[model samples]
Target chain A: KRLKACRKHELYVSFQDLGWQDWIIAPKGYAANYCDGECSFPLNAHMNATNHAIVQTLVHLMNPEYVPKPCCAPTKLNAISVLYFDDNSNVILKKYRNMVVRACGCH
Target chain B: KRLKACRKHELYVSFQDLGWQDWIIAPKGYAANYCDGECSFPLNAHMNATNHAIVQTLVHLMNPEYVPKPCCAPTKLNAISVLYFDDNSNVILKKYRNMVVRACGCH
Candidate 1:
């Protein structure tokens, strides 16, 4: 539960710091948004909703409607490369990568 | 310097423990492969090569030619989810996710 709380808090702060004060919304069909419903939600739902908000934050940052989720890498003469930075930046990117692949409708 | 050495060592062990002793190869064009050249290579080159090998190991595990890389999550009623497990499993998946999006040719 500690890890869950830490992850969720980090995600929440990431959204706020990224200027997404009003971006946290319901998953889709729910009547209330994160601000309204998250406090009372179950643990899984809480994490899931936070992950959703995090994805939306990244999508907004990238200024794209959607980025295709990739399941594998390609082959080329050159080796693979990832967007590796320091801990903070890499944490955001890693979360984004996780959300991008899991969210519905993405490729 | 310490971080770089630690990362490289961890990647090396991950490969070895996953039974990828012979899978460490050149990035693409180098005459010699990882087993031959990595020790003498520059730090960046060494890391890049190890990242590539990690990707290949994941591909082998998934039994897929490639998995598409997603940049954003899709819209849906349900919330986003990620493959979260214990330390070792999550570490593997995290590294795989990083490599899957970075390797060449993947979507």
Candidate 2:
């Protein structure tokens, strides 16, 4: 269903983060020009990293040999980043911080 | 309509060209795991060149295929990136480099 598509993948990045409101941004939008067409987070980012950073992040997100350092990577965290916003929506922005680390449980 | 939801995908990354928030052993959130979960930018970007490399970005945005560079799918200046904090709703995280550009004109 089209409704579900919009629901499952989308972030609710708030303007308040920058100190704004829903009405001023676009009247009906939040992070107007800051999102992809589907209103999702950066499609190619891991966090808000560049293309290269996202690639490096894959090492940890997928579990490979070229693992990032323990301190550099946030092991106890989720591979994905979902920040909350105030748009009266449960969904929020999902950014992939290009850096890599062990999943939520490592030495 | 759940609102235009987010609006068309455009580059609002006026936040490029760093402003003193240099590397700090990498933080815990952002795309580089350094972002404060705000659809942030790179806390550390090894641009393969100097982060201060004064790039001619519009070079690609205006016309990548027009002749001499590479941008997004079809442009010459598409160094822009996207990143949201949440995922349930359409709260996309629009990240601009930590630096700032002159915008719609020249430096």
Candidate 3:
């Protein structure tokens, strides 16, 4: 298969899909997207790359032990208001911070 | 200035320029880059913007007081080693993490 470069891809997580429809009262699920793919050299424009990534990448290449392995991860996250039941078995609506990934980048 | 877009720009700083050449023994100066520009809508490719910035940018536009002003800043940083004379006239060598801006982005 052809290689898949890093980028923000959409994926949904439905409570119904996860068999959590019983507790999740409102909006069955969410667009809890995730990040996947390579953080290879010469990061693309849409990768939403950073300066640190580029520098660290080059260093990692020269000496892998001196740096961390680059990986595609969430660069931006957002909160989501989830309506679900708590342990008390009550319908509760709460705002969960960083519940959704808004963007991805190499780190 | 023709609306300078956000990107990594080079700038060299010399200890002699700051009158610290006497104390700074090794590497009289270094590149201490900075980030400056508008985090406007539809962030450009080189800006290295994250997803949160995009969402926040839109939110800020919708309500100025609801969110903080978007800014272009260092998204990645690197450490630097320096040899300098400290108080008590003692010469010391040390490493300062996140001392140099490696990349710029909007946040």
Candidate 4:
């Protein structure tokens, strides 16, 4: 079914699919899913909202001009290592930060 | 002078300085400085912490094992565009997210 309301969604990122096989050489790809859905009123535990977000949401509902609705974003992230070729054909394995999402929350 | 308290610092990232000029082009450098300092007890307004962080700090002060102290991190971030060369020597302008820090906070 199509997604509705706030929740985490599954997504797979394939480097080969993006035609980076010539450069990136590793696990090829991984599950780099993302978060989607609405952050409407009355966020529940599953939503994992921050206290500030809750307050902001309430204020925004009351006065739209004063505050904006909380945005659903990644609350936790992990790193990923990509083995790619450098300019001189040197292979380098670089670890990039915040490359993977672990959890999502309203913030 | 060495930093002692919670605050932001100045930093300039020079791609040419780092020998990334072989691939990266345009905007030889940018100000991508970072946040520094402590998340000690009694976080003040200057620290720019969220409500959850404040509550978590207080709880940690009482029960050391229950919660951990808030850490200093970038509370807000912005994106940056980089023109770099691909494997085919093609210049691609890529917009990277969360490449620059805009604000710091105890989180």
Candidate that would win on TM-score? 3
Among residues 3 or more apart in sequence or in different chains, the pairs in candidate 3 whose N, CA or C atoms overlap within 3 Å are A51-B103
Tens digit of per-residue lDDT, candidate 1, span A1-107: 32322111101113333333443332211111010011111223132333323332333334333321111111112221123345344422221211211121111
Q: What TM-score number comes out for model 2?
A: 0.17
Per-candidate Cα RMSD to the true structure, in Å, reads 22.0, 23.3, 16.4, 24.4
DockQ of each: 0.04, 0.02, 0.04, 0.02
TM-score for chain B of all predictions: 0.16, 0.16, 0.79, 0.69
Model 1 off-target regions past 4 Å?
A: A1-49, A64-107, B1-76, B84-87, B90-107
| lDDT head-to-head 1 vs 3, winner | 3
lDDT of 3: 0.63
C-alpha DockQ for predicted model 3: 0.04
Error of 2 at B16 (Å): 43
Model 3's interface RMSD = 11.6
Report the CAPRI category for model 4: incorrect
Report the C-alpha lDDT of model 4 over B1-107, residue by residue, as the tens digit.
Answer: 23564455555566665567778878787766555566665665434754444444554566566444555555776777888887898889987666565776665
Per-residue lDDT of B17-92 in model 3, one digit per residue for the tens? 5567878889887776555555676687766565545655665665575344445566677777888889788989
Q: Would you estimate the TM-scores of all the predictions?
A: 0.15, 0.17, 0.49, 0.48
Model 1, position B20, has a per-residue lDDT of: 40
